[PDB]
């Protein structure tokens, strides 16, 4: 049995959160929590909420046991980009892409 | 391209913009521009010989 959570349209750039996500793929729910807590990155805040919500899903909806949960899968997909103007010199206007992430955490049960 | 609503202005200078050279945006090479040899209202009738 698996349990998923997705945070869609989080305003952080995908390549950046993925760094944090990579840290907890395949980890126990317990280790992932400790890892995320002392990861000095903005993304850790977002990964944590998705992770903590999928846990809640597992326990509450899917008849899974907290003490057995581990991170079976996790990935970051790109959402639509917020496109903004960055004024450069000599009347030139650049476009900044303020990017977006769709963060998925999938939890399973480690038996035995 | 002459029947299209756009202006006849040259959209940017001929040289030194680093872009391709263009005239008005009514040109068929533009999206929204005129069309080159599209249909115009015409009469398909013709006098077939009465004997035939």
């Amino acid at each position: 049995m698996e349990a998923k959570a997705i945070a869609r349209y989080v305003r952080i750039s995908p390549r950046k959160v993925r760094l944090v996500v990579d840290l907890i793929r395949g980890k126990s729910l317990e280790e992932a929590r400790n890892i995320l807590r002392y990861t000095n990155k903005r993304g850790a805040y977002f990964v944590a909420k998705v992770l903590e919500s999928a846990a809640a899903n597992a326990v509450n909806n899917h008849d899974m046991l907290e003490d057995r949960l581990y991170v079976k899968a996790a990935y970051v997909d790109e959402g639509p980009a917020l496109k903004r103007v960055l004024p450069r010199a000599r009347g030139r206007a650049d476009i900044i892409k303020k990017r977006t992430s769709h963060i998925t955490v999938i939890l399973g049960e480690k038996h035995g | 391209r002459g029947e299209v609503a756009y202006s006849g202005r040259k959209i940017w200078p001929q040289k030194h913009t680093g872009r391709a050279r263009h005239g008005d945006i009514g040109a068929p090479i533009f999206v929204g521009g005129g069309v080159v040899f599209g249909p115009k209202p015409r009469d398909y009738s013709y006098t077939l010989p009465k004997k035939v």
Binding site: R90, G91, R92 | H16, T17, G18
Partner: peptide, 16 residues
């Protein structure tokens, strides 16, 4: 040795 000069003195442009 001074010979011809086959190019004007250069100056930088401005893209946009």
């Amino acid at each position: 040795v001074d010979k011809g000069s086959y190019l004007p003195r250069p100056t930088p442009p401005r893209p946009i």
